[PDB]
Structures are given as structure tokens and as C-alpha cells.
Design a protein around this ligand. Structure first.
Ligand code: JNL
Ligand code: MG
Ligand code: ZN
Length: 313
């Protein structure tokens, strides 16, 4: 196990920054992920034979959709890497192990549809899981892959440490349900502003890990404008697809998902920066000061969307 992964100089440098884009070379993304684990965790955390076999089974069970794809998984894992590297001593060995795997797995077997469209379609998964429908499925898919012959990357953990990591991964994945983020951020807001926030309180850590997961999940709004803008097309390609499918069930969908209402996208993006993205990275910056560069980048991209509306581009 004296085999390190190395990246070219430019990647080796930019991968440490929050705004890093992992590039269009699909075949470099596994090595980028392993590189991040080795540096975040240790070269010993995982048996490389098993990690590599886990990664490629995880890749396979992500679909060919415009946004909720294998690129998203690795992109979300890189944001978590940057958060963990910039907050060295606040996280247990198990939490670093668990959260990078949770980020890679967080959207397993996503089809490009919201929990809402599964409910109105009456998809079988909506009957199996009444809330956080896709997220419970994503955690299901994660456990399934972990139990394949030769895929159990945690094998060398004790029974209770193994229970702790699957529990970290379950809550981390469930927290990527944006419906739950509002209450979670509201509670974290009050806890930090009445001084009751306490990182030795497990139920507090849980909330703070959940906010990190939302932050990593939304990290496209924290990239340089050209990456943010080009990722928005992919996000809206899924939204408009779901809108089309709503119209096939005989329901006018929200404007956000109606491809006849593209003109409304810039204003809809302001709503999302102001209601979701800026509050998210604000509370995270208050709790984890060194994640400020995510808040600053998000503010720069809000400004870029205001300029789009003003016709300046
Ligand atoms: C009540 O129903 C609500 C309320 C608040 C938010 C939501 N959900 C909601 O708006 N989802 C969006 C929209 C635009 C987005 N734009 C970008 C670039 C990214 C990364 N994520 C987005 C997520 C639903
Ligand atoms: Mg998701
Ligand atoms: Zn996601």
C-alpha cells in the first residue's frame, strides 16, 4: 500500500480549492476521488482493491441523465473534501471515511425526477418510502453495493464502528432532501445565535453534517460563473423533462419546470440564491469559518444572475 495517486500539477493545486471543476475526462474521476480519500482519511482507511471495486460499482448505478449523474456524485464529494481539509481537527476518523462515501453515493440510481413527481406518478418507491423517497432509495442502493462480494470497504472496522459509519451515511444521504434543509438550517441558526450550539452533542453534529451535505449538494452555485451557468442548463434540462411528464399526467407544473417559461429562469434563480443557497452557506460560514470562500463565490454568482436580468448579459 505504498501506491499513492498523484495528479498533474494544475489539478494537484486547484483540487484544494472549493471552486475546483473536476473536468470533462470521465476516466480521471475515480483517481481524483481516491486521491481525495487518501489525503482526507489516509492511504490505509480502505483496501485499494476494494475501494476501486466499490467506486466502479457506484459509477455503474448512476444513470445517463443530464445532471443527477456520476459527474454530480464526484463533484459533491470534492466539495465535502475541501470542507474537511479546511476543518482538519473538527472531524473524527469515521466521519471523514463516511461523508466522502456518503457524497459519492448520495444520488445513486437517480432518474432525474423530484420526490413530488414520484408521488403524482404513484411510483412504487413512493409507496415503499412516504418521505425523502429518492433519498431512502439512494441509501438502499448504497447498502446493496456494500454487500456485493469484495465491495465492503469498511470490513476492517469493529461491529460498533461499522454501525456508526452506516448511521453517519444514512443521515448524511437523507439530509440531501432539500425539503428537510429549511427546518435543519432554521434550528442551526437559533442554536448558533443563542450560543447553545455544541459539537460534543451528537444531535447537533448531525444537524451540522446535514448542512454540510446541503452545501456540498448545491456546490455548483459556488463555482466560477462559466461552470455555474453551464451546470444550470443541465439542472434545467431535468426540470423541463419533469415538467413535460407532469403535463402528460395532466398537471400544469410550476414555472421552474415549464420549458415554455424559460424567460422566467433568471428570476427563479434569484429566488433560489436568496431562499436556499445564500442562507445555506451563511449559516455554514458562521458554524465553520474556513468555508467562507463558498459564501463569497455564491454571492459573486448571485450578482452574475442579477446582471443576466438587467440585460447586461
Ligand atoms: C415549497 O417548495 C420548495 C421551496 C423551496 C425550494 C424548492 N426546491 C427547489 O427550488 N429546487 C431547486 C431550484 C433551482 C436550483 N438551481 C440550482 C442551480 C441548484 C443547484 N439547485 C436548484 C434546486 C421547493
Ligand atoms: Mg439527491
Ligand atoms: Zn445531489
Amino acid at each position: 500500500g505504498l501506491m499513492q495517486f498523484t495528479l498533474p500539477v494544475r489539478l494537484c493545486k486547484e483540487i484544494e480549492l472549493f471552486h475546483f471543476d473536476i473536468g470533462p475526462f470521465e476516466n480521471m474521476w475515480p483517481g481524483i476521488f481516491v486521491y481525495m480519500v487518501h489525503r482526507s482519511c489516509g492511504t490505509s482507511c480502505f483496501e485499494l482493491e476494494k475501494l476501486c471495486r466499490f467506486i466502479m460499482s457506484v459509477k455503474k448505478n448512476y444513470r445517463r441523465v443530464p445532471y443527477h449523474n456520476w459527474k454530480h456524485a464526484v463533484t459533491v464529494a470534492h466539495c465535502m473534501y475541501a470542507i474537511l481539509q479546511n476543518n482538519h481537527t473538527l472531524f473524527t476518523d469515521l466521519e471523514r471515511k463516511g461523508l466522502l462515501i456518503a457524497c459519492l453515493c448520495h444520488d445513486l440510481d437517480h432518474r432525474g425526477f423530484s420526490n413530488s413527481y414520484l408521488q403524482k406518478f404513484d411510483h412504487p418507491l413512493a409507496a415503499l418510502y412516504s418521505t425523502s423517497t429518492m433519498e431512502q432509495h439512494h441509501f438502499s442502493q448504497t447498502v446493496s453495493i456494500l454487500q456485493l462480494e469484495g465491495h465492503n470497504i469498511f470490513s476492517t472496522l469493529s461491529s460498533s464502528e461499522y454501525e456508526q459509519v452506516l448511521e453517519i451515511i444514512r443521515k448524511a444521504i437523507i439530509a440531501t432532501d432539500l425539503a428537510l434543509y429549511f427546518g435543519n438550517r432554521k434550528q442551526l441558526e437559533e442554536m448558533y445565535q443563542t450560543g447553545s450550539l455544541n459539537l460534543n452533542n451528537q444531535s447537533h453534529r448531525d444537524r451540522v453534517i446535514g448542512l454540510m451535505m446541503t452545501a456540498c449538494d448545491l456546490c455548483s452555485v459556488t463555482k466560477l460563473w462559466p461552470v455555474t451557468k453551464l451546470t444550470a442548463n443541465d439542472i434545467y434540462a431535468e426540470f423541463w423533462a419533469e415538467g413535460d411528464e407532469m403535463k402528460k399526467l395532466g398537471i400544469q407544473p410550476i414555472p421552474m419546470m415549464d420549458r415554455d417559461k424559460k424567460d422566467e429562469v433568471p428570476q427563479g434563480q434569484l429566488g433560489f440564491y436568496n431562499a436556499v443557497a445564500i442562507p445555506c452557506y451563511t449559516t455554514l460560514t458562521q458554524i465553520l469559518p474556513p468555508t467562507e470562500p463558498l459564501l463569497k463565490a455564491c454571492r459573486d454568482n448571485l450578482s452574475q444572475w442579477e446582471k443576466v436580468i438587467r440585460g447586461e448579459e
